[PDB]
Structure formats: C-alpha cells, structure tokens
Amino acid sequence: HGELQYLGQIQHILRCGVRKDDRTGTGTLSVFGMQARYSLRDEFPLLTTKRVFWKGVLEELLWFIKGSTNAKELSSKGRDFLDSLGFSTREEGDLGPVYGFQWRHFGAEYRDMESDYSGQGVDQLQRVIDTIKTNPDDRRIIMCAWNPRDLPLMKLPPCHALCQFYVVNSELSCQLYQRSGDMGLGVPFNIASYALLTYMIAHITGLKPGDFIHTLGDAHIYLNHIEPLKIQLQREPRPFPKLRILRKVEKIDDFKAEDFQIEGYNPHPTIKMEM
C-alpha cells in the first residue's frame, strides 16, 4: 500500500529531520532527498489518512491547463510575487506568469491576463503529448514549472518542478522532481495533481497509467504541523479509490471538471493544517 511510503517519509523526517528555516524564517524539520512510487494501475493515489480536497485539485489543474493568469477564473478551489506587480493590474486579479502560462506559453513576453498568446512561446504540455505520439521511447518528455516569485528575482532562475513522462508496454508513467516539498499540505495535493495530469495524458494518447514517482529535494515538515502529522501517522491507510473518466476525450483542452468521477474513496477525517 503506497500511502505507506508517504507515512514512512513523515516518520523519517520526524525522527531524523533537522531544524532548517524557510525564506520567511519559519522553522521546519528537513531531510534532503526522498522518493516514493505510487501505482496508477486500477487505482488513484488520493491519500486516505486524511480527506484530500480532490474537487479543488481537479479545478486548479483545469485552470493550469487553460493557461490562465486570471485569479478570478479560478473556481471554488481558489505571497511575495505580488510586490513586483503594478497596483491597478494587481487589483484586476492579473497574477502574471503562473503555472498555466508557463506550461502553455513558456518563454513568451507576458503582457496582460486577457491578451491573445495563441502560438506564442513553447507549449510544454502540448509538446509532451506530441512527443508521446511521435516517439514514445524519448527520454526528454519533460515539462517544468517555476515558482512565480522567482521570475522577477533573477535571470534564468531554476525551476521549482521538473515533470518527466515515460512510456513502455502501453503504460504512461510520470516522475515529478520538486526542489522542495511541504509534506503536510503541498505533497498530498501534488501527488493527486500529477497523478490526475497523468491520467489525462494517458487517456488522450491511448495509454494506460503506470506509475507516479515523487522525488523531493528539501522535504520538510513545518513546526506547526508536527502534532497533527503525528496523529495522522497513527491512522491506517484504506485501499486507494479509482478515478474514472466519463467520456472519450481527444484534446487536453477539452476535459472538464464534470468528466471525472472518484469512486471507493473512504478517507479518514480532514486534518486542518494551516500555512
């Protein structure tokens, strides 16, 4: 049961992690370098040791897929990067280059959130889907995401996340490298989010989902999540649910919140952890 990997990693950080401050001076327990493998075959790794907000993971992911930079466009599932924006454009909800923009218009000059960027920049997501169809053996089927606060801070900043796909025997697998991971909040969300992305891409390429591998650099627990995570560790996982796609879909841009159904999801209660 692969949620055991996640819980194993929480325990290891609690026993062996060392104190390390994050950019805001808030404290964490930290271990550098970890990896977990979650099977996507006839199951979907929505964590069961607490209720994960799946409807919002879906909706944030559809928003990324659209290429939006408009905060208002986010549905019910709605830091320092805002400081580098002008006033009036910021009050509109124009967030600047975010995950959508980077995924769909990588390297284009970002103007305003309602501009037409059709055919501007590299479409990383479409490039991934194309390479799977044209050469499934390719070792470069890679899409990267940047923390948006980094973009105004330096020339050629490194990505936050590197996502690599892989195809053999009709199965699509995905590895996410994250240079840092908040184990209490971000990680469970990210697992579901990239597992879902993988389900989508597999669906439109005629493949079956394989594995989801999650690799971290700075894997950390915030000090104020220690006690709830200690309680989460006492809970026993329950078989993962299944994810079902409800109609045949052909292009990544056509999926809709309503195309997806989770089933057999029996999680333990919500754990409220706050940032």
Which residues contact a copy of itself (rule: CB under 8 A)?
Answer: 18-23, 30, 32-35, 37, 106-107, 122, 137-140, 142, 144, 150, 155-159, 162, 164, 166, 168-169, 173, 175, 177, 179-180, 210-211, 213, 215, 217-218
The answer to the question of whether 140 is labelled as a binding residue is: yes
* Least distance between a copy of itself and beta carbon 93 (Å): 27
- Catalytic residue (choose from 144, 159, 163, 174): 159
In the annotation, is 159 catalytic?
Answer: yes
Burial class (CB in 10 A: 0-12, 13-18, 19+), 107: exposed
Beta bridge partners of 182: 220
Tokens standing for residue 27: 């404290």
**DSSP code of residue 207:** -
Let me know: does 73 contact 63? Beta carbons within 8 Å: yes
Of 63 and 106, CB closest to a copy of itself: 106
**DSSP code of residue 70:** B
* Least distance between a copy of itself and beta carbon 243 (Å): 21
The answer to the question of whether 160 is labelled as a binding residue is: yes
The answer to the question of whether 147 is labelled as a binding residue is: no
* Least distance between a copy of itself and beta carbon 49 (Å): 23
The answer to the question of whether 37 is labelled as a binding residue is: no
Of 48 and 173, CB closest to a copy of itself: 173
Let me know: does 213 contact 36? Beta carbons within 8 Å: yes
Q: How far apart are CA 256 and CA 75, in angstroms?
A: 12
The answer to the question of whether 221 is labelled as a binding residue is: yes
Beta bridge partners of 35: 215
Of 37 and 242, CB closest to a copy of itself: 37
Buried b (16+ CB within 10 A) or exposed e, 52-76: bbbebbbbbbbbbbebbbbeeebee
DSSP 3-state assignment of 56? Answer: helix
Burial class (CB in 10 A: 0-12, 13-18, 19+), 238: middle
Q: How open is the CA angle 153-154-157, to the nearest 5 degrees?
A: 105
* Least distance between a copy of itself and beta carbon 142 (Å): 4
104 residue type, one letter: R
* Least distance between a copy of itself and beta carbon 150 (Å): 7
The answer to the question of whether 23 is labelled as a binding residue is: yes
Binding-site members for dUMP are 23, 139-140, 159-160, 179-182, 190, 220-222
Binding-site members are 23, 139-140, 159-160, 179-182, 190, 220-222
Positions marked catalytic: 159
